[PDB]
Amino acid sequence: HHHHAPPTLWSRVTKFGSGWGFWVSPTVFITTTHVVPTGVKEFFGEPLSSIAIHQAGEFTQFRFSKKMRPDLTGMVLEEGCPEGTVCSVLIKRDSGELLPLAVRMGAIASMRIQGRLVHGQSGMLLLGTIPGDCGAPYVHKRGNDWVVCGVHAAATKSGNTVVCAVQA
């Protein structure tokens, strides 16, 4: 129904590097830093010169100088969700399957994950995440508008707790 992730929202989820990223708007693409390709001079055809790239705490944002997805409306990127919010992780698999995972979000905090400092939010799954799912967006529908508040970065060994990286 209307309040499940619509097809256009899923169409923002894009295979990228060793995971996924997400078109927040025609010009802004977000992902988790560790999936990003290394040593490239262009992204989606555009030279790095034309791209503002902001990377911190495992969150990466690309702001392009051209409309890359002109078909899309701009949506709100927030710095995480409030504790208790139920978000969906929009997981695409290479098979083509779409797997919206319901997650109850916890607190925003700094975490050390395999040596890297993550500006993260943990959440409890309400179906699990696997290697290759990173970059997948954490989204929720606030009244009439969809909000994106993080990108998938990690899961506990049990798989029952996930972490998304959030923007400063």
State which of residues 8, 50, 55, 156 lies at the interface with ligand TKP (CB under 6 A): 156
- What span, in angstroms and rounded, lies between the C-alpha atoms of 164 and 33? 12
Q: Which of residues 110-149 bind ligand TKP (CB under 6 A)?
A: 111, 113-114, 116, 118, 129-131, 133-134
- The rounded radius of gyration (Å) of the Cα atoms in the chain is 15
- What span, in angstroms and rounded, lies between the C-alpha atoms of 35 and 46? 19
Task: Select 13 or 72, whichever has its Cβ closest to ligand TKP.
Answer: 13
Whether 34 is catalytic is: yes
153 binds ligand TKP (CB under 6 A): yes
Show me where the chain is broken: residue before each gap, C-N > 2.5 A. 126
- Residue written as token pair 């990286």: 165
Residues in the interface with ligand TKP (CB under 6 A) total 19
Q: Are 50 and 41 in contact (CB under 8 A)?
A: no
Listed in sequence order, the DSSP H helices in the chain are 7-10
37 binds ligand TKP (CB under 6 A): no
Whether 54 is catalytic is: no
Indicate the residue whose CB is closest to ligand TKP.
134
157 binds ligand TKP (CB under 6 A): yes
Q: What is the largest CA-CA distance in the chain?
A: 43
Whether 134 is catalytic is: yes
Q: Which residues bind ligand TKP (CB under 6 A)?
A: 19, 34, 58, 111, 113-114, 116, 118, 129-131, 133-134, 153-157, 163
Active site residues: 34, 58, 134
